[PDB]
Ligand binder design. Sequence first.
Ligand SMILES: O[C@@H]1[C@@H](O)[C@H](O)OC[C@H]1O
Length: 305
Amino acid sequence: VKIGMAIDDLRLERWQKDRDIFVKKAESLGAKVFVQSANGNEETQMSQIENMINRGVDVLVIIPYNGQVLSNVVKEAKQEGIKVLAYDRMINDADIDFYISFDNEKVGELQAKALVDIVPQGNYFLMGGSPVDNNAKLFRAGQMKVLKPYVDSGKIKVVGDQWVDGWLPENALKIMENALTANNNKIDAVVASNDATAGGAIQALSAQGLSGKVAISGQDADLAGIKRIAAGTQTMTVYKPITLLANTAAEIAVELGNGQEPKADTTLNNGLKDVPSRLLTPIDVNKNNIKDTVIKDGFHKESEL
Ligand SMILES: O[C@@H]1[C@@H](O)[C@H](O)OC[C@H]1O
């Protein structure tokens, strides 16, 4: 099997581990991988994809920079019998064959569940991510799925709901400060949607003497987030191991090149079709499993804690 991998952006740390695990795993399955990076550019990506189609790849793996505008290039690929796999970000209104990501709804469920595990009754502030980030709404659906029976039954009372523009720690800091002022510090848990916003909220909580007293969730397992969890000031984070995502995408890619129809958790609509999807299970990280998750995986080093 010939794989073309069109990564939007390899100039950052973002996708580089994904490339390397994907490449080494695909090769080990008996496949050749040609990789290009669009250096953040949407027109470079169109060209590199066209380049792949014209090299005779059997499978395209695309991490899109702008997934609203690859419809023609995908159609062109399908016309040649090439399979398209959308890696991590969905490709919209395109005739793709597969989608692999972590299950973002599950990220939300994990976040809210770790919080009702310790604060089954009390005042909750909802801190969503960017209101233009579709993933932000996904985390919030998962969070609300878990909260619903507690809200409807009066055990949990929602005392604010704000979305953090740009996921900026400093916007999250202001948001939190406003929520604390408006509730005269009576906030028992904060459903923050990532580590960076949680971190800004924690700074507001710290400045009122409430650090360690208010439950707060997160996501990404940022080093600093891992440290706050060890220190008691953040409750939990959700880890999304690259090696798992990259490993599973390679196996799907190879499967797709072999006419086979790979294992899909569900079917997401991209606004043209019901795309089969593997939505990997994300990992709850708390104070007790830091070593067994993010250290073991190599994501962070013990000497760094
Ligand atoms: O991993 C998170 C990502 O999915 C979301 O889109 O933006 C914030 C990050 O914390």
